[PDB]
Amino acid sequence: VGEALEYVNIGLSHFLALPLAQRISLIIIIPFIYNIVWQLLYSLRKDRPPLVFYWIPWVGSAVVYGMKPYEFFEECQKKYGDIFSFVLLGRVMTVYLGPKGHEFVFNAKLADVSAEAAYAHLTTPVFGKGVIYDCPNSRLMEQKKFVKGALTKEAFKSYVPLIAEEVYKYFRDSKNFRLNERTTGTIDVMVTQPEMTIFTASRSLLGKEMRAKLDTDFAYLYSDLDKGFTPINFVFPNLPLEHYRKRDHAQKAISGTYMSLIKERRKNNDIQDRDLIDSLMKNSTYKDGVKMTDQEIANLLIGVLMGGQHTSAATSAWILLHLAERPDVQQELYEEQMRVLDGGKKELTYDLLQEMPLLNQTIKETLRMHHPLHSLFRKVMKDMHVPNTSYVIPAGYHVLVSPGYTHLRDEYFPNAHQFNIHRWNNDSASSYSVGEEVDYGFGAISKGVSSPYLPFGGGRHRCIGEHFAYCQLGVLMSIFIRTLKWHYPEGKTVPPPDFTSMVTLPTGPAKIIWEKRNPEQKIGGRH
Ligand SMILES: CC[C@@H]([C@H](C)O)n1ncn(-c2ccc(N3CCN(c4ccc(OC[C@@H]5CO[C@@](Cn6cncn6)(c6ccc(F)cc6F)C5)cc4)CC3)cc2)c1=O
Ligand code: HEM
Ligand SMILES: CCCCCCCCCCCCO[C@@H]1O[C@H](CO)[C@@H](O[C@H]2O[C@H](CO)[C@@H](O)[C@H](O)[C@H]2O)[C@H](O)[C@H]1O
């Protein structure tokens, strides 16, 4: 026995004396073996969801999850049911699929899970300090209340002619169109739609000055910041490379530009109700009396604009891509436009937009088939018991909810991979609570989150951009439809999504051919 412990020490001594070829080998062999041995032992636990088996330690199932997460989820669901875990670049992700998973994650108690712990490294290096996920949840709650204050029906009534003007200016001036000189052409929708999205969102949310900045070489800083918004930040939020230096420079340069305008407005008492900058200047005091700083206001503007940027641009790209092979839908949308707008002799308004159910259904169905965020995360902060099961999700795990997966299940949407706006006949609203409501600090929202359709999430982290997105996408598509027909180049079809980008944007290049419905039509104004 004691003789055995001497040979332990002797063996530790011969271990250290191995050739570095074998020391390195054992430094790879041993973690690999322990990994398999640990999973086998882990698979015995009754109080843990099944864990997806994986060969490479730390890396885990990262590759297949990034490649095709919904296909990854469907196979895991067939072997294990609706709750299962997998490891992901160092973390254990516990997936809860379906409406009860929406309920488990979106309505989790604030003490149990943390969104800022999952997201802060993704967003803080892009947006700046102090806001969104670089702050306590109750600060986020009031930030959402401040922003929502500029997102009112009356705000939407004035945004509509502004967004319309921007769309027409883009048809007139952009290289991709020039409708006054060309009656047909080919565009890449991942080129045109990010540009149309930033032009229209700038003009309406940021205001006339910040929109004017985009006609200068200042627009290059927006490109730099936009490039810093990448899921690489989940792993490498700060690397001493040039990518990160352009991003950081841009955040300072852009937030400096907003602080410049904010300070000029306050210095001149020029604070109105024009844009979200005005609104946050008048309404950014937290409930404990602390005011947001001009730096925090500008970082919140960056965040709101940048999140809205990627979700909205991806969605209008998909709308265009689904309609390019559906000339029947384009025709039906065109007729609705002629009826609602008296043949075009009525100007588009926010209220008339609400009388365009097929247009809004087309947005709604695109968001069904293309949730821009396939996976939403929380870090588990206290152990969580999974109701009706033996499972306990321990602190340090992550929970993963995926309403976009349920969007594509035939159980809840018959023929789920068919694009059919008519599945929403009589139900064209962007969403609506099926019953009771609750207020986390930014307005009463649906208490239950068991709806199989959840493009905007639910609970305390629920989107507040839904009506701005519909207003923006609504004006934009109304004008596209009334102005152009479009179709695919020959043999091309809807592309598959890129599930490794920030949003589930289409795999490019994704080109459509447009044509003027009225070749002789000319867009006025000066260029
Ligand atoms: C390593 C080998 C490699 C090979 C090649 O496979 N590989 N292997 C694996 N993968 C891989 C695997 C998975 C992924 N990602 C999964 C995670 N996704 C993701 C994206 C965004 C997320 O957003 C978090 C918040 C929520 O709200 C937002 C956004 N927002 C809401 N409304 C408007 N904006 C928000 C809110 C408020 C604001 F004010 C602002 C905001 F922005 C931000 C959360 C999750 C990205 C894709 C990527 C790659 C690989 O590439
Ligand atoms: C197609 C358009 C959009 C979709 C599908 C969408 C989706 C979502 C989802 C699913 C969440 C919840 C994330 C989570 O629970 O982890 C969210 C949150 C949020 N979104 Fe959007 N969004 C869209 C557009 C916008 C726009 C246009 C804005 C701003 C103008 C915006 C601002 C926000 C904010 C401020 C939050 C709250 C983040 C939090 O509380 O953690 N979104 N959105
Ligand atoms: C006897 C018949 C007489 C008929 C009288 C008719 C009165 C009509 C009154 C219209 C009310 C709209 O008036 C005003 O609209 C603006 C929108 O630009 C709103 O402004 C709102 O959106 C803007 C733009 O994001 C934000 O900067 C602002 O913080 C927000 O509150 C005002 O909060 C609202 O007060």
XYZ file of C-alpha atoms and ligand atoms in Angstrom:
656
model
C 0.000 0.000 0.000
C 2.667 2.493 1.044
C 4.806 0.739 -1.566
C 2.114 1.717 -4.077
C 2.270 5.391 -3.150
C 6.046 5.453 -3.697
C 5.377 4.193 -7.233
C 2.820 6.972 -7.717
C 5.625 9.459 -7.027
C 8.016 7.397 -9.160
C 5.508 7.423 -12.017
C 4.948 11.162 -11.702
C 8.729 11.465 -11.985
C 8.854 9.339 -15.146
C 5.907 11.290 -16.574
C 7.864 14.565 -16.411
C 10.867 12.870 -18.065
C 8.995 11.802 -21.201
C 10.263 13.123 -24.556
C 8.465 16.332 -25.549
C 6.986 14.435 -28.502
C 5.042 12.294 -26.019
C 4.447 15.035 -23.442
C 2.706 17.017 -26.196
C 0.929 13.873 -27.397
C -0.316 13.128 -23.879
C -1.340 16.780 -23.561
C -3.759 16.088 -26.438
C -4.578 12.426 -25.728
C -5.470 12.894 -22.051
C -8.048 15.718 -22.450
C -9.639 13.811 -25.345
C -10.008 10.637 -23.261
C -11.277 12.490 -20.189
C -13.845 14.230 -22.409
C -15.332 10.938 -23.644
C -15.092 9.430 -20.153
C -16.847 12.447 -18.630
C -19.685 12.431 -21.189
C -20.319 8.722 -20.600
C -20.512 9.352 -16.852
C -22.557 12.525 -17.442
C -25.107 10.525 -19.472
C -25.955 8.674 -16.236
C -27.374 11.738 -14.479
C -31.160 11.740 -14.122
C -31.179 15.452 -13.196
C -29.605 16.631 -16.490
C -31.062 16.837 -19.993
C -29.315 14.628 -22.539
C -26.032 16.123 -23.749
C -25.204 15.953 -27.458
C -22.099 13.845 -27.919
C -19.042 15.549 -29.411
C -15.414 14.558 -30.111
C -13.369 17.774 -29.895
C -13.174 19.173 -26.348
C -14.175 22.801 -25.754
C -15.172 23.242 -29.416
C -18.082 20.837 -29.104
C -21.005 20.956 -31.533
C -20.065 24.510 -32.623
C -19.570 23.674 -36.297
C -22.867 21.942 -37.124
C -24.786 24.389 -34.932
C -23.323 27.307 -36.895
C -23.851 25.613 -40.262
C -27.522 24.555 -39.966
C -28.905 25.108 -36.444
C -32.512 24.271 -37.285
C -31.412 20.992 -38.858
C -29.175 20.438 -35.817
C -32.162 21.109 -33.546
C -34.474 18.760 -35.466
C -32.155 15.757 -35.119
C -31.528 16.456 -31.431
C -35.306 16.746 -30.991
C -35.829 13.341 -32.636
C -33.281 11.555 -30.415
C -33.877 13.372 -27.118
C -37.155 15.294 -27.204
C -37.502 19.027 -26.688
C -34.910 19.764 -23.979
C -31.256 18.850 -24.495
C -27.814 20.376 -24.059
C -24.764 20.755 -26.261
C -21.402 22.328 -25.701
C -20.425 25.399 -27.704
C -16.909 26.934 -27.753
C -16.506 26.434 -24.003
C -20.124 26.843 -22.833
C -22.907 24.308 -22.214
C -26.051 25.387 -24.076
C -29.367 23.885 -22.898
C -31.956 24.107 -25.698
C -35.672 24.024 -24.839
C -37.575 23.726 -28.131
C -41.171 24.725 -28.737
C -43.791 26.857 -26.974
C -42.867 25.494 -23.541
C -39.272 26.521 -24.227
C -40.454 30.018 -25.069
C -42.149 29.952 -21.670
C -39.113 28.526 -19.862
C -36.653 31.130 -21.188
C -38.585 34.268 -22.110
C -40.567 34.242 -18.822
C -37.726 32.970 -16.612
C -37.438 34.878 -13.356
C -34.970 37.772 -13.407
C -33.071 36.032 -10.602
C -32.661 32.817 -12.595
C -31.152 34.021 -15.904
C -29.144 36.918 -17.318
C -29.326 38.296 -20.830
C -26.548 40.853 -20.271
C -24.212 38.058 -19.146
C -24.820 36.327 -22.478
C -24.772 39.340 -24.755
C -22.526 42.075 -23.308
C -19.396 40.948 -25.152
C -21.299 40.905 -28.454
C -22.684 44.446 -28.111
C -20.701 46.620 -25.677
C -17.541 46.816 -27.894
C -19.801 48.056 -30.744
C -22.325 50.304 -29.015
C -20.204 51.745 -26.210
C -20.350 51.644 -22.445
C -23.214 52.138 -20.038
C -26.195 51.001 -22.126
C -28.233 47.997 -23.271
C -26.182 45.079 -21.944
C -23.438 47.136 -20.267
C -25.684 47.944 -17.296
C -28.166 46.342 -14.875
C -31.449 44.992 -16.205
C -33.506 47.790 -14.598
C -31.481 50.345 -16.534
C -32.183 48.407 -19.752
C -35.884 48.405 -18.835
C -35.970 52.197 -18.634
C -33.781 52.643 -21.700
C -36.442 50.658 -23.578
C -39.066 52.995 -22.063
C -37.125 56.078 -23.204
C -36.763 54.770 -26.774
C -40.376 53.607 -26.956
C -41.333 57.200 -26.176
C -40.263 58.239 -29.654
C -42.021 55.197 -31.189
C -45.589 56.427 -30.984
C -48.403 56.362 -33.521
C -47.859 60.093 -33.987
C -44.157 59.509 -34.454
C -45.026 56.903 -37.098
C -47.414 59.330 -38.791
C -44.536 61.756 -39.370
C -41.937 59.061 -40.195
C -43.970 57.778 -43.164
C -43.440 60.690 -45.605
C -39.797 60.861 -44.479
C -39.178 57.165 -45.148
C -41.091 57.492 -48.438
C -38.916 60.443 -49.501
C -35.759 58.457 -48.728
C -36.943 55.425 -50.742
C -37.716 57.637 -53.756
C -34.385 59.494 -53.380
C -32.655 56.121 -53.436
C -34.535 54.999 -56.563
C -33.516 58.308 -58.165
C -29.860 58.549 -57.130
C -28.344 55.171 -56.235
C -26.121 53.416 -58.756
C -28.326 50.346 -58.270
C -31.428 52.036 -59.701
C -31.388 55.482 -61.347
C -35.021 55.147 -62.407
C -34.840 58.437 -64.306
C -32.198 56.946 -66.633
C -32.828 53.169 -66.585
C -36.054 51.177 -66.964
C -34.537 47.850 -65.886
C -31.474 46.542 -64.059
C -29.926 43.934 -61.773
C -29.276 44.469 -58.051
C -27.790 42.511 -55.164
C -30.374 42.801 -52.389
C -27.682 42.552 -49.706
C -26.214 45.708 -51.263
C -29.396 47.736 -51.764
C -31.219 46.776 -48.598
C -28.559 47.705 -46.010
C -28.268 51.084 -47.789
C -32.032 51.704 -47.947
C -32.359 50.584 -44.321
C -29.689 52.972 -43.001
C -30.927 55.907 -45.128
C -34.554 55.504 -43.983
C -33.733 54.716 -40.340
C -31.265 57.615 -40.127
C -33.665 60.191 -41.550
C -36.570 59.245 -39.256
C -34.954 58.043 -36.013
C -31.706 60.088 -35.992
C -32.967 63.149 -37.881
C -32.090 65.332 -40.801
C -28.539 66.222 -39.707
C -27.410 62.648 -39.091
C -28.973 61.566 -42.383
C -27.043 64.360 -44.104
C -23.830 62.903 -42.628
C -24.345 59.791 -44.756
C -23.819 61.785 -47.985
C -20.203 62.417 -46.814
C -17.116 60.275 -46.326
C -18.421 60.002 -42.758
C -20.492 57.101 -44.105
C -17.270 55.068 -44.074
C -17.263 55.123 -40.267
C -20.730 53.560 -40.314
C -19.290 50.804 -42.499
C -16.426 50.320 -40.016
C -18.752 50.161 -37.012
C -21.187 47.904 -38.865
C -18.342 45.488 -39.615
C -17.569 45.306 -35.878
C -21.075 43.848 -35.288
C -20.138 40.165 -35.819
C -20.564 36.963 -33.750
C -16.747 36.793 -33.558
C -17.194 39.159 -30.578
C -18.692 36.203 -28.683
C -15.163 34.708 -28.719
C -12.771 37.583 -29.559
C -14.381 40.907 -28.548
C -10.937 42.594 -28.374
C -7.931 41.588 -30.501
C -4.968 43.897 -31.241
C -5.845 43.833 -34.970
C -6.921 46.505 -37.441
C -10.517 45.238 -37.624
C -10.946 46.150 -33.954
C -9.193 49.524 -34.346
C -11.495 50.703 -37.148
C -14.504 49.559 -35.090
C -13.385 51.315 -31.880
C -12.416 54.468 -33.788
C -15.799 54.449 -35.510
C -17.740 54.087 -32.247
C -15.901 57.104 -30.829
C -16.214 59.119 -34.049
C -19.921 58.306 -34.488
C -20.929 58.740 -30.842
C -18.923 61.977 -30.844
C -21.057 63.120 -33.779
C -24.274 62.430 -31.852
C -22.945 64.128 -28.705
C -21.984 67.077 -30.891
C -25.564 67.465 -32.141
C -27.035 66.816 -28.671
C -24.850 69.516 -27.091
C -25.589 71.985 -29.894
C -29.335 71.419 -29.474
C -29.158 71.977 -25.706
C -26.912 75.041 -26.105
C -29.542 76.632 -28.396
C -32.641 75.341 -26.529
C -33.421 73.690 -29.878
C -35.163 70.637 -28.448
C -38.365 69.669 -30.289
C -40.200 66.419 -31.168
C -38.402 65.707 -34.448
C -36.501 62.467 -33.886
C -35.314 59.996 -31.260
C -32.439 62.324 -30.317
C -34.922 65.049 -29.279
C -36.931 62.425 -27.386
C -33.966 61.045 -25.413
C -32.805 64.583 -24.592
C -36.219 65.296 -23.042
C -36.826 61.931 -21.444
C -33.780 60.027 -20.167
C -33.953 60.278 -16.367
C -34.054 56.961 -14.516
C -36.451 56.329 -11.631
C -33.716 56.863 -9.015
C -33.019 60.377 -10.386
C -29.791 59.632 -12.316
C -29.765 61.138 -15.806
C -28.192 59.353 -18.758
C -24.999 61.004 -19.970
C -24.677 62.388 -23.475
C -22.224 59.534 -24.044
C -24.795 56.977 -22.874
C -27.537 58.570 -25.004
C -25.292 58.371 -28.068
C -24.330 54.770 -27.318
C -28.027 53.923 -26.965
C -28.720 55.560 -30.349
C -25.917 53.442 -31.854
C -27.342 50.270 -30.356
C -30.942 50.930 -31.365
C -29.956 51.914 -34.910
C -27.546 48.991 -35.291
C -29.870 46.252 -34.035
C -32.727 47.635 -36.104
C -30.277 47.947 -39.023
C -29.488 44.237 -39.315
C -32.921 42.790 -38.500
C -34.722 45.137 -40.886
C -32.245 44.912 -43.782
C -32.212 41.125 -43.644
C -36.032 41.107 -43.640
C -36.573 43.406 -46.614
C -33.959 41.371 -48.522
C -35.954 38.197 -47.847
C -39.274 39.876 -48.782
C -37.774 40.832 -52.138
C -36.298 37.350 -52.587
C -39.577 35.531 -51.868
C -41.523 37.885 -54.154
C -39.027 37.585 -57.048
C -40.372 34.065 -57.753
C -43.984 34.905 -56.818
C -45.336 37.225 -59.524
C -48.789 36.240 -58.251
C -48.156 37.803 -54.828
C -46.677 40.934 -56.466
C -49.883 41.289 -58.506
C -52.110 40.818 -55.455
C -50.029 43.381 -53.523
C -50.264 45.774 -56.469
C -54.080 45.540 -56.503
C -54.265 46.265 -52.773
C -52.052 49.321 -53.346
C -54.390 50.568 -56.102
C -57.515 50.015 -54.023
C -56.192 51.456 -50.771
C -54.461 54.433 -52.423
C -57.197 55.280 -54.976
C -55.074 54.338 -57.967
C -52.049 56.160 -56.558
C -53.864 59.482 -56.197
C -53.637 59.213 -52.401
C -50.413 59.842 -50.546
C -49.227 56.999 -48.342
C -49.875 57.701 -44.643
C -49.405 55.670 -41.479
C -53.158 55.122 -41.217
C -53.492 53.919 -44.820
C -50.640 51.459 -44.147
C -52.896 49.860 -41.534
C -55.486 49.343 -44.292
C -53.036 47.175 -46.301
C -53.487 43.733 -44.699
C -51.866 41.726 -47.543
C -48.726 43.916 -47.419
C -48.494 43.431 -43.648
C -49.194 39.696 -44.060
C -46.242 39.489 -46.484
C -43.937 40.991 -43.837
C -45.469 38.681 -41.220
C -44.924 35.533 -43.347
C -41.352 36.516 -44.219
C -40.617 36.965 -40.511
C -42.152 33.515 -39.987
C -39.836 31.842 -42.501
C -36.830 34.004 -41.714
C -36.518 34.860 -38.045
C -33.440 37.130 -38.191
C -32.184 35.727 -34.866
C -32.223 31.919 -34.878
C -31.031 31.614 -31.252
C -31.603 33.767 -28.167
C -29.439 33.206 -25.078
C -29.404 33.659 -21.325
C -26.759 32.635 -18.802
C -28.247 30.583 -15.956
C -27.607 32.358 -12.634
C -29.320 30.040 -10.102
C -30.144 26.361 -10.529
C -33.415 25.945 -12.420
C -35.806 23.024 -12.183
C -37.445 22.147 -15.508
C -41.153 21.687 -14.613
C -42.662 18.218 -15.166
C -39.134 16.748 -15.433
C -36.247 15.497 -13.321
C -33.940 18.042 -14.994
C -32.004 20.739 -13.140
C -30.148 23.329 -15.248
C -27.280 24.510 -13.006
C -25.832 27.989 -12.757
C -23.123 28.566 -15.341
C -25.098 26.859 -18.066
C -26.721 28.806 -20.866
C -30.334 28.333 -21.946
C -31.109 28.680 -25.652
C -34.565 29.561 -26.994
C -35.383 29.366 -30.717
C -38.835 30.601 -31.766
C -37.557 30.617 -35.375
C -37.346 26.828 -35.170
C -41.032 26.557 -34.170
C -41.883 28.978 -37.012
C -40.703 26.230 -39.385
C -42.598 23.265 -37.814
C -45.552 21.808 -39.755
C -47.273 21.053 -36.408
C -47.805 24.770 -35.865
C -47.721 26.143 -39.439
C -49.063 23.668 -41.997
C -46.671 23.385 -44.936
C -44.131 25.424 -43.016
C -41.563 25.788 -45.849
C -44.144 27.156 -48.286
C -44.263 30.968 -48.440
C -47.989 31.785 -48.174
C -49.126 35.202 -47.000
C -52.715 33.946 -46.982
C -52.081 31.802 -43.927
C -52.458 35.175 -42.128
C -55.831 36.134 -43.687
C -57.817 38.003 -40.999
C -54.685 37.959 -38.738
C -52.355 40.552 -40.288
C -51.189 42.280 -37.075
C -47.448 42.128 -36.383
C -48.448 40.242 -33.178
C -50.992 40.587 -30.339
C -51.344 39.231 -26.808
C -53.833 36.353 -26.659
C -54.913 37.532 -23.189
C -53.429 38.962 -20.003
C -50.561 41.494 -19.887
C -47.676 42.712 -17.717
C -45.282 45.672 -17.522
C -41.566 45.239 -16.862
C -40.890 48.962 -17.130
C -41.480 49.794 -20.807
C -45.201 49.173 -21.340
C -47.726 46.395 -20.863
C -46.906 43.354 -23.002
C -48.240 39.812 -23.253
C -47.937 37.868 -20.000
C -47.803 34.468 -21.705
C -45.181 33.795 -24.356
C -46.471 30.378 -25.464
C -47.414 31.605 -28.941
C -45.698 29.451 -31.609
C -45.107 32.666 -33.613
C -42.638 34.894 -31.697
C -40.635 37.002 -34.165
C -40.081 39.696 -31.459
C -39.544 37.424 -28.442
C -41.371 38.102 -25.202
C -41.048 38.824 -21.525
C -38.729 41.489 -20.164
C -36.312 41.345 -23.146
C -39.057 41.612 -25.765
C -38.485 43.783 -28.817
C -39.704 47.364 -28.813
C -38.904 47.919 -32.512
C -41.807 45.905 -33.948
C -43.985 48.861 -35.046
C -41.049 50.849 -36.368
C -39.925 47.779 -38.324
C -43.417 47.339 -39.807
C -43.710 51.060 -40.570
C -40.293 51.094 -42.252
C -40.759 47.803 -44.114
C -44.335 48.828 -44.929
C -43.474 52.152 -46.574
C -40.516 50.557 -48.347
C -42.447 47.609 -49.804
C -45.462 49.765 -50.728
C -43.196 51.888 -52.952
C -41.255 48.926 -54.381
C -44.552 47.274 -55.347
C -46.107 50.399 -56.824
C -42.889 51.286 -58.714
C -41.262 48.032 -59.843
C -41.821 44.449 -60.853
C -38.954 42.065 -60.256
C -37.913 38.476 -60.892
C -34.894 36.185 -60.672
C -32.145 35.788 -63.245
C -32.781 32.586 -65.104
C -32.339 29.408 -63.047
C -31.865 31.281 -59.735
C -34.189 30.852 -56.736
C -34.490 31.893 -53.073
C -31.051 31.342 -51.464
C -30.553 29.467 -48.183
C -29.838 31.489 -45.040
C -26.380 32.179 -43.645
C -26.866 31.106 -40.033
C -23.324 32.215 -39.053
C -23.825 35.920 -39.747
C -25.211 38.254 -37.101
C -28.707 37.715 -38.534
C -29.991 34.923 -40.785
C -29.374 36.958 -43.937
C -29.481 35.273 -47.375
C -26.414 33.555 -48.749
C -25.047 35.857 -51.429
C -24.800 37.083 -53.948
C -28.602 37.182 -54.171
C -29.552 39.096 -57.322
C -32.923 40.194 -58.696
C -33.833 41.929 -61.948
C -36.158 44.930 -61.582
C -38.259 46.740 -64.189
C -40.225 49.981 -64.053
C -43.972 49.453 -64.044
C -44.133 52.909 -65.661
C -40.925 53.287 -67.723
C -41.811 56.936 -68.393
C -42.236 57.760 -64.680
C -39.707 60.294 -63.379
C -38.759 61.010 -59.772
C -38.596 64.751 -59.061
C -36.192 66.783 -56.959
C -32.583 67.722 -57.611
C -29.563 65.476 -58.187
C -15.916 28.386 -35.460
C -16.307 27.496 -36.626
C -17.365 28.159 -37.505
C -17.683 27.343 -38.762
C -17.627 28.236 -39.999
O -18.995 26.774 -38.676
N -18.588 28.477 -36.706
N -19.012 27.556 -35.723
C -20.126 28.092 -35.132
N -20.386 29.255 -35.758
C -21.401 30.068 -35.371
C -22.443 29.660 -34.516
C -23.479 30.500 -34.082
C -23.506 31.821 -34.516
N -24.467 32.770 -34.090
C -25.460 32.291 -33.121
C -25.768 33.521 -32.262
N -26.332 34.565 -33.133
C -26.822 35.714 -32.436
C -26.880 36.944 -33.072
C -27.384 38.078 -32.436
C -27.872 38.007 -31.138
O -28.389 39.139 -30.539
C -28.322 39.389 -29.130
C -29.118 40.636 -28.761
C -30.617 40.411 -28.933
O -31.151 41.647 -29.431
C -30.128 42.373 -30.113
C -30.392 42.276 -31.612
N -31.687 42.861 -31.960
C -32.949 42.616 -31.589
N -33.706 43.474 -32.304
C -32.928 44.247 -33.116
N -31.651 43.874 -32.921
C -30.201 43.818 -29.775
C -31.132 44.267 -28.847
C -31.215 45.627 -28.550
C -30.385 46.529 -29.197
F -30.451 47.846 -28.948
C -29.465 46.109 -30.142
C -29.330 44.784 -30.467
F -28.400 44.418 -31.371
C -28.782 41.765 -29.728
C -27.840 36.771 -30.500
C -27.321 35.641 -31.142
C -25.470 34.901 -34.295
C -25.100 33.646 -35.093
C -22.482 32.262 -35.338
C -21.477 31.408 -35.746
C -19.427 29.513 -36.660
O -19.336 30.537 -37.447
C -37.645 42.553 -38.251
C -37.401 43.347 -37.209
C -37.045 42.820 -35.799
C -37.105 41.600 -35.230
C -37.604 40.257 -35.830
C -36.626 41.732 -33.868
C -36.508 40.741 -32.920
C -36.153 40.909 -31.588
C -36.062 39.870 -30.586
C -36.346 38.373 -30.857
C -35.687 40.426 -29.415
C -35.471 39.705 -28.068
C -34.045 39.183 -27.900
C -33.914 38.261 -26.712
O -34.914 38.045 -25.978
O -32.799 37.723 -26.497
C -35.532 41.859 -29.637
C -35.166 42.811 -28.696
C -34.994 44.157 -28.922
N -35.049 44.800 -30.145
Fe -35.691 43.900 -31.967
N -36.281 43.058 -33.661
C -36.531 43.747 -34.819
C -36.332 45.084 -35.026
C -35.914 46.024 -34.082
C -35.844 47.437 -34.331
C -36.220 48.023 -35.713
C -35.419 48.037 -33.197
C -35.174 49.548 -32.909
C -35.689 50.527 -33.671
C -35.226 46.999 -32.194
C -34.782 47.150 -30.895
C -34.817 46.143 -29.941
C -34.610 46.345 -28.522
C -34.305 47.739 -27.909
C -34.708 45.146 -27.899
C -34.595 44.837 -26.381
C -33.360 44.038 -25.958
C -33.525 43.491 -24.561
O -34.444 43.941 -23.829
O -32.722 42.604 -24.177
N -35.527 45.785 -32.771
N -35.814 42.118 -30.973
C -62.189 70.800 -32.756
C -61.252 69.999 -33.643
C -59.787 70.380 -33.421
C -58.835 69.284 -33.901
C -57.555 69.246 -33.063
C -56.545 68.219 -33.581
C -55.293 68.143 -32.706
C -54.229 67.202 -33.285
C -53.040 67.015 -32.336
C -51.965 66.076 -32.895
C -51.068 65.520 -31.785
C -49.679 65.077 -32.266
O -48.697 65.887 -31.612
C -47.346 65.400 -31.440
O -46.812 64.526 -32.451
C -45.411 64.247 -32.242
C -44.829 63.442 -33.402
O -43.973 64.245 -34.225
C -45.204 63.502 -30.920
O -43.812 63.299 -30.639
C -43.400 61.956 -30.321
O -42.577 61.464 -31.393
C -41.402 62.262 -31.616
C -40.634 61.784 -32.847
O -39.923 60.578 -32.524
C -40.504 62.265 -30.375
O -39.388 63.145 -30.575
C -41.292 62.696 -29.140
O -40.506 62.502 -27.961
C -42.572 61.870 -29.021
O -43.288 62.280 -27.838
C -45.789 64.356 -29.800
O -45.654 63.680 -28.542
C -47.249 64.686 -30.095
O -47.765 65.536 -29.064
